[PDB]
A paper describes a structure:
In this paper, we report the crystal structures of a lectin from Agrocybe aegerita, designated as AAL2, in its apo- and complex forms with GlcNAc and GlcNAcβ1-3Galβ1-4GlcNAc, as part of our endeavors to develop a system to facilitate the identification and purification of O-GlcNAcylated proteins. AAL2 was recently discovered from the fruit body of the edible mushroom A. aegerita. AAL2 was found to specifically bind nonreducing terminal N-acetylglucosamine (GlcNAc) moieties of either alpha- or beta-linkage and was reported to have the activity of inducing apoptosis in hepatoma cells in vitro as well as inhibiting hepatoma growth in tumour-bearing mice in vivo. The overall structure of AAL2 monomer is a single domain with the shape of cylindrical torus with a diameter of about 51Å and a height of about 27Å, showing a very regular, seven-bladed β-propeller fold formed by the blades packing in a circular array.
The structures of AAL2, AAL2-GlcNAc and AAL2-GlcNAcβ1-3Galβ1-4GlcNAc were determined at resolutions of 2.0Å, 2.1Å, and 2.0Å, respectively. There are two virtually identical AAL2 monomers arranged around a two-fold pseudoaxis of symmetry in an asymmetric unit in both the structures of AAL2 and AAL2-GlcNAc, and one AAL2 monomer in AAL2-GlcNAcβ1-3Galβ1-4GlcNAc, while the protein exists as monomers in solution as determined from its elution volume on a Superdex 200 10/300 GL column. The ligands we used were GlcNAc monosaccharide and GlcNAcβ1-3Galβ1-4GlcNAc, a trisaccharide showing very high affinity toward AAL2 in glycan array analysis. GlcNAcβ1-3Galβ1-4GlcNAc ligands are bound to the same pockets of AAL2, with the non-reducing terminal GlcNAc (1’-GlcNAc) adopted the same position as GlcNAc. The interactions between AAL2 and 1’-GlcNAc of the trisaccharide are identical to those with GlcNAc monosaccharide. Although there are several hydrogen bond interactions between AAL2, such as Lys138, and the LacNAc moiety after 1’-GlcNAc, AAL2 doesn’t demonstrate specific preference to the 2’-Gal or 3’-GlcNAc in all the six blades, since the interactions seem to be random. This result was rather unexpected based on the glycan array. However, our results have further proved that AAL2 recognizes the terminal non-reducing GlcNAc moiety of a polysaccharide. AAL2 was also shown via SPR to bind to the trisaccharide with a Kd value of 41.65 μM, which is close to that of GlcNAc, demonstrating that Gal-GlcNAc moiety beyond GlcNAc may not affect the binding between AAL2 and trisaccharide.
Numbering used by the authors: 3 to 404
The structure:
């Protein structure tokens, strides 16, 4: 189940060779997954010191906007959305083209503090539409090919800042197939209910439906940051289940099809605030560590990397330390360093990659959820005196080849 969340707006293939994309100070640096990693400056734009880009005002992502199966550089900037197409041959277009005068800080009054902006193929046509949770609800710009985007259209008066009272500090809004039709639907962790809105197929979304009375700020006491929540396929049927890291551990509600969810159950007695897990220090992720199509729980704790394996049915084995690195004890801080759990080897078993203090480090999956010795991939993409500070730079893992 390919999903889109606030922390990871770019879906990464469970089986593939994830590339490094770094919106750095001077422009976009590409670290193509290859035998000899050689990061290069591809576009002199989308940057703090090239185009005047700011993490506080702008959004920078990767998506296939043309339908060639190549990942393009996309930037929600001031006057609109800019796209540097992947021209193949390891080159990106420079300068980019502005494909639409909306979804911008100036053009549209879009705010990182209030609104969300995603790129998703919600029509399943092979290229990414623009989907934004704005002021009055959900706005969609349909991708008509050739970088021609239709006007931003309000397709659902909900999940908005001024449409249902949605807040970044209280609520969560993801895209995921929860019905089982292969089409991304809207999933919203509101105040008292987890809601879903069905993808109607025509680029619009059905009125919100309350489906869970849990996983929310006023239903179970789930707080932003402290208790992270995730949409993921935990059974292998392609639908998104729901899993959160609460107080006493991880709670799961299983997708029973059509957006109907089973009862919320405690499946792992770990990864929660009761056992020291904190938002500021201990990032958690759902990834497939065994290549069976089921998401396992991965956590970067104090002493290093802990993993709880999925039994295959949404039930889990107990969490255990699998790596003595990438933790607090090894100098890792959320404020300065990045960490991702993605397949780098094409075996469908997620590997670990950390953008650390002075080097980008890696740990490969043996194919069964065990991890080998840490190797240094490059000196690039590391914090390095603020050369790659998260405040000014944005690092993503992405599949430039789709
Ligand atoms: C009336 C007025 O002066 N308003 C100010 C805005 O103009 C200003 O936005 C900057 O506006 C530029 C056009 O006047 C331009 O759109 C610029 O966007 C940048 O444009 C370049 C060239 O196309 C592009 O390469 C670059 O990527 C792009 N950067 C971003 C982030 O979009 C825009 O920033 C605004 C900010 O200074 O302040 C307003 O007062
Ligand atoms: C800080 C403050 O008090 N100001 C608030 C306004 O920011 C807020 O605004 C805006 O309302 C507009 C209608 O008067 C409009 O809905 C606007 O949204 C935008 O709508 C256009 C289409 O009409 C769309 O193209 C664009 O993408 C969309 N932008 C966003 C971000 O959704 C909206 O910002 C106002 C509520 O109306 O409340 C004020 O207090
Ligand atoms: C008193 C207290 O401690 N609890 C307050 C919450 O009740 C309150 O939440 C609002 O509760 C409503 C109950 O009828 C409702 O669930 C509302 O959620 C909104 O519901 C509509 C459909 O009815 C839906 O379209 C919309 O998307 C949804 N919005 C969200 C964000 O969930 C809910 O906000 C809360 C905020 O007022 O304050 C609590 O203190
Ligand atoms: C130090 C101490 O003992 N403090 C007590 C708290 O631990 C306790 O909080 C709650 O503990 C519950 C188990 O005893 C449980 O973990 C609960 O989490 C919530 O549990 C419900 C199901 O019971 C679940 O639906 C919900 O999703 C889940 N929420 C989260 C975010 O995990 C937890 O709040 C407190 C109240 O019982 O009492 C303290 O004395
Ligand atoms: C000017 C100065 O003295 N700065 C100090 C920082 O350098 C220091 O950070 C640590 O920097 C080290 C420089 O060699 C090193 O990069 C270290 O990174 C850790 O390296 C180990 C061994 O390869 C690796 O296993 C681990 O994963 C890795 N951790 C990270 C986050 O990359 C880094 O912690 C800082 C903390 O002591 O203090 C500064 O004063
Ligand atoms: C967040 C985390 O890693 N918690 C795990 C736990 O915690 C560490 C301890 O290993 C260490 O001794 O103290 C630090 C605080 O200074 C953390 O609390 O270790 C548990 C297993 O022993 C594990 O279940 C927790 O998830």
């Amino acid at each position: 189940s390919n999903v889109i969340t606030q922390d990871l707006p770019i879906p990464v293939a469970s089986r593939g060779f994830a590339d490094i994309v770094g919106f750095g100070l001077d422009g976009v640096v590409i670290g193509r997954n290859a035998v000899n990693l050689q990061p290069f400056l591809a576009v002199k734009n989308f940057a703090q010191n090239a185009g005047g880009w700011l993490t506080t005002k702008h959004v920078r992502l990767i998506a296939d906007t043309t339908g060639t199966g190549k990942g393009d550089i996309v930037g929600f900037g001031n006057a609109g959305v800019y796209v540097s197409v992947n021209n193949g041959k390891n080159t990106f277009a420079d300068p980019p083209k502005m494909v639409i005068a909306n979804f911008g800080y100036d053009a549209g009054g879009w705010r990182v503090e209030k609104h969300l902006r995603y790129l998703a193929d919600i029509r399943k046509t092979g290229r990414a539409d623009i989907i934004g949770f704005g002021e009055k609800g959900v706005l969609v710009s349909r991708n008509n090919g050739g970088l021609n985007f239709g006007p931003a259209t309000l397709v659902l008066k909900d999940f908005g800042y001024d449409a249902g009272g949605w807040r970044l500090d209280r609520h969560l809004r993801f895209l995921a197939d929860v019905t089982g039709n292969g089409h991304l639907d809207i999933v919203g962790f509101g105040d008292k209910h987890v809601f879903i809105s069905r993808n109607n197929g025509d680029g619009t979304f059905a009125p919100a439906k309350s489906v869970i009375d849990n996983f929310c700020i006023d239903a179970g006491g789930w707080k932003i940051g402290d208790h992270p929540r995730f949409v993921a396929d935990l059974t292998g049927d392609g639908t998104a289940d729901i899993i959160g890291c609460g107080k006493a551990g991880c709670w799961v509600a299983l997708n029973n099809g059509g957006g109907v969810f089973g009862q919320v159950k405690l499946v792992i007695n770990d990864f929660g605030t009761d056992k020291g897990w904190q938002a500021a220090k201990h990032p958690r992720f759902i990834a497939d560590l065994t290549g069976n199509g089921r998401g396992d729980v991965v956590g970067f704790g104090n002493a290093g990397v802990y993993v709880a394996l999925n039994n295959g049915d949404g039930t889990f084995q107990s969490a255990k330390l699998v790596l003595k690195d990438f933790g607090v004890q090894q100098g890792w801080t959320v404020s300065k360093h990045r960490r991702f759990v993605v397949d780098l080897t094409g075996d469908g078993c997620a590997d670990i990659i950390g953008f650390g203090e002075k080097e980008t480090l890696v740990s490969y999956n043996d194919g069964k959820g065990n991890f080998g010795p840490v190797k240094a991939l490059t000196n690039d993409f590391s914090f390095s005196g603020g050369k790659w500070a998260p405040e000014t730079t944005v690092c993503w893992m992405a599949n430039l080849d789709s």
